[PDB]
């Protein structure tokens, strides 16, 4: 039961209090909780906003800053935030150029963020949504209708964050995020489960040398469990899965702020195919040594080359975690030169810090 | 077993190939293995060089780049590199302006780097040494005579890296890092042991809700084992040990390149007191949830405040790890104004990256 926590219902208010003390470039609001850039509302730009359960640090709180999110709304551990939070935060950050809500595809998130959106709209706020469904592992999971939203949310928050920074309009930002969402592909595996503090018990259990293949970031069941053999052949099947389950047709809905209604929009993903150009993110799910990630990356670059994909940028680290879970995820996101140009743009958040 | 590896003897190779592919601004050499800046020798400035066993990543490999290390020598997992690697690596990075070796205080490292120093000297490379001994927990550990060198090595690599970059001569670099090493204080705890992949068994084993207090980064015994009580009790007693064991007198050995000999130098540490300004590093030893580190940080600021220490800068994350060990270290480094200017100076390495 090896957690560095105090009182089990206080966990979050200590962690967030710490975050606020660590980063005076961030503001922690009380009653209700949300986090904003210490200098919001930043007048003149699309305010970019996201959130979900806590337990995924640094996602989303660690991405607040210049060239990424404007503010984020954490809920309890592994639970979506409530509309009053999303609403109140999105109004703290509103710049006058509308507000873009990024949402991970999970029932609670979808539901709450949608209702916040309507709430915001009714208060005379231009506002629209991007939905993230990168996890290619299972369809309709425990907490999700369709494909779960995992690590690619970080890349999209970064690339969209950087467009907003530049001067791009609300629709411009939105369609970038939607475009990018049909180009990212993710899969994760676990060798040992996370444990949520309030529960007291591991969120699943694996026998010896068994892995949860295609795990999700709230400790959802994956495709199956199957003997962990070696890091090589794990990366191999993960990579093949990304290609095989790449092709994907489905319905995501966004907020048409003109008509004031939820626009249904069917849309297709293309498999990554010979000749493509990708940002790759080898992402620690919580408690995998960084050292082993580079082993995973090593095998990935071998597989990528073998199937004609060019890795143009990478990230290797804990970017989108699942409390203390031992496992990792691989994301691949198709790019072009406009996209890379946005990648190389400045970002100044506690978790991503490059550029002038 | 939850090791993301292939064959047990290849794990180091795999992971090094991974690092080199991921970061093309670094060069991997073979027979023997070392890692340097792609652009070395950088003619003109003091070459800054460190190393020790693998298993602590990002240290030292993640700290090669402008404004920090010129190169590193990784050895086996938890094993000093042999002097021939240190030798050739320092010959690869020679700036024409001296080479500064940073050596963590361990029997193997000390002996190996010391010999490599004498090797270089005979080859007529101006060289001197800085030794780090921050771990306040135990005098003479399993692998150490005196105090252990842990996470403060990372601050010192950055600060001295910046002086080197700025243009300061070998002597002032060495004098600086040497002053610094008398102002940094560190202590670690573990709630779960690391397993080295080659041994196959955990490197120690703790009973239920029991921690090894004042652990070291090769899984060396601490001051003792003691029941884990809360995160607060833990940060309190870690913090009281940094004061109580602050004051400390010992002999460290540096190479006098002028005289061609080992000059011993008795020097004392001052315990942090009211009025001191510090940099604080809350450090994941491997598998502590980032979330939790912020919780630690939160308690750390309360304790600094009430003792009259003014935290000026911080780092929070996985900076000096022990494979997959569940714990954290706290480093506090005493600073003045020139020090902070060196801190804020640019840095461009795979694990620390800020500034213009």
């Amino acid at each position: 039961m090896k957690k560095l926590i105090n009182d089990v219902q206080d966990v979050l208010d200590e962690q967030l209090a710490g975050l606020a003390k660590a980063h005076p470039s961030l503001t922690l609001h009380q009653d209700p909780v949300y986090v904003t850039r210490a200098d919001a509302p930043v007048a003149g730009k699309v305010a970019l906003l996201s959130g979900g359960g806590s337990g995924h640090e640094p996602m989303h709180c660690g991405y607040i800053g210049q060239g990424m999110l404007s503010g984020a709304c954490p809920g309890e551990i592994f639970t979506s935030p409530t509309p009053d939070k999303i609403f109140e935060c999105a109004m703290q950050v509103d710049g006058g150029e509308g507000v873009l809500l990024i949402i991970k595809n999970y029932t609670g998130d979808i539901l709450n963020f949608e209702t916040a959106t309507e709430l915001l709209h009714d208060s005379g706020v231009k506002v629209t949504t991007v939905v993230i469904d990168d996890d290619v592992a299972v369809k309709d999971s425990l907490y999700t209708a369709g494909r779960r939203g995992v690590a690619n949310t970080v890349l999209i928050e970064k690339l969209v964050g950087a467009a907003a920074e530049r001067g791009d309009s609300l629709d411009a930002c939105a369609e970038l995020g939607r475009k990018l969402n049909n180009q990212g592909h993710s899969i994760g595996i676990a060798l040992g489960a996370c444990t949520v503090p309030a529960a007291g018990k591991p969120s699943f259990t694996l026998a010896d040398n068994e892995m949860e293949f295609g795990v999700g970031i709230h400790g959802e069941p994956g495709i199956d469990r199957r003997p962990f053999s070696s890091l090589d052949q794990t990366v191999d099947e993960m990579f093949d899965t990304l290609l095989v389950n790449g092709s994907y047709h489905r319905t995501l809905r966004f907020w048409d702020y003109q008509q004031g209604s939820w626009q249904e929009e069917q849309q297709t993903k293309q498999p990554l195919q010979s000749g493509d150009r990708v940002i790759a993110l080898v992402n620690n799910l919580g408690a995998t040594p960084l050292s082993e990630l580079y082993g995973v990356y090593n095998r990935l670059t071998t597989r990528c080359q073998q199937a004609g994909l060019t890795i143009e940028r990478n990230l290797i680290g804990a970017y989108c975690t699942s409390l203390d879970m031992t496992g990792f995820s691989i994301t691949l996101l198709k790019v072009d030169d406009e996209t890379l140009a946005l990648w190389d743009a400045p970002v100044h958040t506690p978790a991503l810090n490059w550029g002038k | 077993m939850k090791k993301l590896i292939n064959d047990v003897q290849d794990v180091l190779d795999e992971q090094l190939a991974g690092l080199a592919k991921a970061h093309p601004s670094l060069t991997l050499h073979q027979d023997p293995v070392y890692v340097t800046r792609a652009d070395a020798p950088v003619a003109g400035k003091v070459a800054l060089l460190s190393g020790g066993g693998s298993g602590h990543e990002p240290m030292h490999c993640g700290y090669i780049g402008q404004g920090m290390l010129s190169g590193a020598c990784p050895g086996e997992i938890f094993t000093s590199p042999t002097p021939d690697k240190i030798f050739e690596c320092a010959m690869q990075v020679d700036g024409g302006e001296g080479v500064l070796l940073i050596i963590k205080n361990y029997t193997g490292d000390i002996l190996n780097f010391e010999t490599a120093t004498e090797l270089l000297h005979d080859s007529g490379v101006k060289v001197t040494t800085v030794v780090i001994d921050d771990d306040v927990a135990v005098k003479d550990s399993l692998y150490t005579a005196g105090r252990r060198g842990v996470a403060n090595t990372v601050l010192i690599e950055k600060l001295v890296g910046a002086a080197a970059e700025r243009g300061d001569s070998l002597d002032a670099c060495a004098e600086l890092g040497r002053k610094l090493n008398n102002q940094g204080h560190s202590i670690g705890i573990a709630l779960g042991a690391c397993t080295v992949p080659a041994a196959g068994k955990p490197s120690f084993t703790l009973a239920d809700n029991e921690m090894e207090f004042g652990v070291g980064i090769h899984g060396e015994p601490g001051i003792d084992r003691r029941p884990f009580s809360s995160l607060d009790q833990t940060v309190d007693e870690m913090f009281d040990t940094l004061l109580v064991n602050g004051s400390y007198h010992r002999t460290l050995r540096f190479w006098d390149y002028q005289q061609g000999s080992w000059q011993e130098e008795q020097q004392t540490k001052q315990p942090l007191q009211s009025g001191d300004r510090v940099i604080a590093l809350v450090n994941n030893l491997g598998a502590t949830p980032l979330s939790e580190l912020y919780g630690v940080y939160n308690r750390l600021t309360t304790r600094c405040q009430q003792a009259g220490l003014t935290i000026e800068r911080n780092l929070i994350g996985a900076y000096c790890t022990s494979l997959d060990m569940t714990g954290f270290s706290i480093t506090l480094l005493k600073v003045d104004d020139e020090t902070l200017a060196l801190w804020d100076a640019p840095v461009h390495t795979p694990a620390l990256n800020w500034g213009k």
């Binding site: - | 010999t115 090797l119 080659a198 041994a199």
Partner: protein, 295 residues
């Protein structure tokens, strides 16, 4: 179960297994050059020592190693076939035999504990080494810095109680020879300096024994008195050249002489010079300095 071996195992246990063995890291040829050169003094002493020990111990199966402070094999000799059986485990010129590399073993344990140490059979952490006995003794330098090891290896069934002391007695000769060899080197450098001083005088200078034998003569007085520098040393002065009345008297009277005009005869040629003569009173009798000033 020695308190030593016990600790060594606690060090090894954390980070290696007993059944695995990989060829221990070897320093590649070119940089082995710089590793070997760095020890010429130790190695030229240690080899002589080892060729002799081997010479009076052959035939027998064992090998003899000299390692440096880092456990690096500098040179090997002894039984050809035994060196090769060990060579078949990766013990080669420039192989590192550290504890972290090959586990618990006298090759590394002696240096660590600071005294002669023998490990044999399953005291060794790695199983590959179980039919071997290793003896090694560390050696220190002028300052007291570990500076190498002498070691002896042989099939375990064959170790003798003399094997450990054999390495210790050799370590003693090499260590103890380095220290006193370099004290000679120093007090010899001091001579060359003090000579070059007298070699650099303005005056000719000659000195002799209370008994009458030439002790010192410099290049300059060598030319002036037409003597051969070397061939002159230790030879009686009056047999070297016939001395003038004044000097006879002043040697006898143990009197000093200041800038006196004096005439010497060397091997039938007469030489006119102006001299200063000074008695050097000691316990064993009076020596002398004669200075020949260049007019």
């Amino acid at each position: 179960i020695s308190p030593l071996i016990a600790t060594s195992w606690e060090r090894c246990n954390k980070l290696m297994k007993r059944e695995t063995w990989n060829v221990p890291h070897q320093a590649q040829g070119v940089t082995f050059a710089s590793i070997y050169r760095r020890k010429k003094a130790m190695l030229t002493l240690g080899q002589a020592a080892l060729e002799d020990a081997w010479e009076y111990m052959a035939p027998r199966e064992c090998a003899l190693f000299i390692l440096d402070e880092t456990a690096c094999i500098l040179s090997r000799n002894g039984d050809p076939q035994t060196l090769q059986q060990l060579s078949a485990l990766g013990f080669n010129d420039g192989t590192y035999c550290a504890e972290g590399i090959i586990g618990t073993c006298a090759l590394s344990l002696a240096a660590i504990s600071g005294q002669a140490v023998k490990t044999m059979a399953d005291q060794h952490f790695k199983q590959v080494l179980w039919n071997w006995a290793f003896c090694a003794t560390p050696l220190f330098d002028s300052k007291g810095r570990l500076t190498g090891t002498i070691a002896l290896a042989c099939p375990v069934e064959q170790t003798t109680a003399a094997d450990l002391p054999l390495t210790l007695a050799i370590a003693r000769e090499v260590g103890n020879l380095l220290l006193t060899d370099s004290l000679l080197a120093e007090t010899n450098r001091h001579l060359n300096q003090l000579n070059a001083l007298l070699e650099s005088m303005d005056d000719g200078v000659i000195s002799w024994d209370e008994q009458g034998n030439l002790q010192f003569i410099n290049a300059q007085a060598a030319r002036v008195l037409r003597l051969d520098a070397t061939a002159s040393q230790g030879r009686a002065i009056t047999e070297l050249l016939t001395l003038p009345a004044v000097l006879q008297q002043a040697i006898k009277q143990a009197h000093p002489l200041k800038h006196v005009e004096a005439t010497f005869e060397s091997q039938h040629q007469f030489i006119d010079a102006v001299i200063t003569l000074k008695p050097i009173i000691e316990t064993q009798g009076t020596s002398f300095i004669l200075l020949l000033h260049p007019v």
